Ligand binder design. Sequence first.
Ligand SMILES: [Cl-]
Ligand SMILES: [Cl-]
Ligand SMILES: [Cl-]
Ligand SMILES: [Cl-]
Lengths: 336, 336
Amino acid sequence: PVINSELWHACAGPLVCLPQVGSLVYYFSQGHSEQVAVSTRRSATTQVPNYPNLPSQLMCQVHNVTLHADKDSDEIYAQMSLQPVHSERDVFPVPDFGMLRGSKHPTEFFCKTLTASDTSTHGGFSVPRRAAEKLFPPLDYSAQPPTQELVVRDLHENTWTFRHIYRGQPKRHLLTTGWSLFVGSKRLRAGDSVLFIRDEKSQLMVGVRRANLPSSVLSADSMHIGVLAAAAHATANRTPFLIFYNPRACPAEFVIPLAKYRKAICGSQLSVGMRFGMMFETEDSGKRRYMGTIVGISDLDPLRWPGSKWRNLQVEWDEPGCNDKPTRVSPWDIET
Amino acid sequence: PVINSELWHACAGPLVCLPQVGSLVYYFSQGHSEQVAVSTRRSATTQVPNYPNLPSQLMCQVHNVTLHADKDSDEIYAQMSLQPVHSERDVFPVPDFGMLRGSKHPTEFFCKTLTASDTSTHGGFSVPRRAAEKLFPPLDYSAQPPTQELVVRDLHENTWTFRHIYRGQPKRHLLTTGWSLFVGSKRLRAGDSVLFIRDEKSQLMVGVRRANLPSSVLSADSMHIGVLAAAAHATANRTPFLIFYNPRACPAEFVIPLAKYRKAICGSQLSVGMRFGMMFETEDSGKRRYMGTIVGISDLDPLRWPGSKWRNLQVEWDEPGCNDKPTRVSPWDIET
Ligand SMILES: [Cl-]
Ligand SMILES: [Cl-]
Ligand SMILES: [Cl-]
Ligand SMILES: [Cl-]
């Protein structure tokens, strides 16, 4: 049974764009370690060894990309198989990878943070008008309650019926019967998000994000050492290595399409003082451009990773707000 | 709040004997990988790199041993901090480690596989006579039901009262009220084991073993590579590295006290044709000696680990039974 790519993408976030299979990429060991530190709640220790043969940006070809979701937690991540390429001799032509499909977000969707009344025993889930009119089939507004049943599929192949009703003073679109069963069964709370989409097959699907336990196989350090050693050993032998990317836990993508890297680096010219826009995901899974200024250009970590493009742009924001946005970003993160 | 060492040891198994803090040990990277393969359901890949500086038996000093248990699963394991020592200069004297306590099993205990009637809504838990008389306070056998309430502590600091009753035709010691609450709350099934002990403080405690989900942080390979790289990097720098040992999942101890290694190796003399006894844990957490014959003495893995003492004795058993016992063992596993 095959995992729904679009719902996976809706859940992943609007800015998530995965490398295509068969494509060249740059793999940034520092970005990898960052994702591991999040998962490990502890940062990459000072001791992790030197790998002289492992560059800060390792050109690979994508052997495979697969999409995963956990049925109890709703954790999602992609597994990518990357082979480092040192010359054209290391590069499988793209046809050798068979037919590929795009990694696309659904164009019809909505996403909402759950309120307290979305999760209360009575009250139901309130749907915004435009979302109900775009995503649900049209109601018979002459019915004494206008109402219908929606059959919705989740990312784990389970089906759920929700009663969709239009009532109240003022009238509101609500999901009632079956909604509280979903909330109960999945242990959703206020603060979590729920998303509805139509996929390419016009299937009505539903996805979940959860707001805000250590491994007892390997120490945090060994996991951090293993990240580095697997890449260094793959580089030496030109063998495939498998990375995981969790787009809800990962602070920044660390597998960067060559085309994206080139547009940002090779052609461009960046300076301290420069103005720039960076896209951020918004609460309803939209995108919003935030402006700032480059205030420095320098190595994130001059000792371990000299000259690394990873997070080498020190930036300040026009609207810092709660000091939400990162103080360092990478050249491929900005537009101008 | 401090984890009960004896109950931890009762749960761990009768043959489990951990290295003392401050002590010298040999660390067997191959044994480590074996434990990781169990946890990973996939074995150490062919590709894991050569580490010329990492010997098959790495002398370390034990910096620390701590005991852990998971409250939902009842998984238990120990974390050991090991520093490789290359000369006497690398060795902290033992007093520098402060007061140490022994790692001892409780002398008063019992363990039972749960039956179907141990887990049925009625029926209760049947306790063997000798176990009830040794572990529970004496009953008033003149009472119309002889009965008492036992206050029992689990490994996670939770308290449980069980009603202990003596009734039936024939009379049986049973745990009734509160037992089914325990079974329900902990999701125990027939096949799982339950253990009761008195600790050093004469506290009545209860432990659980369960009969018969992959990491999405790091690939199986990287975890296997990390095991090797952490040890090799600790060896080069003489720095501490932290290993986990799960005694219910680990096929053989891979951190071997120097004293145990020496008795088995340095003094001894082993031959093909030789008879030997090896201890195995029994169902009621007793120990049973099994006899066999050494049928070969040779490297487990001559290519990657030449001359390694790890699982270098090929053995046949007097009673193979279901082909339960390992076909290779290590010199420190046998007596003669
Ligand atoms: Cl490095
Ligand atoms: Cl380039
Ligand atoms: Cl090796
Ligand atoms: Cl020795």
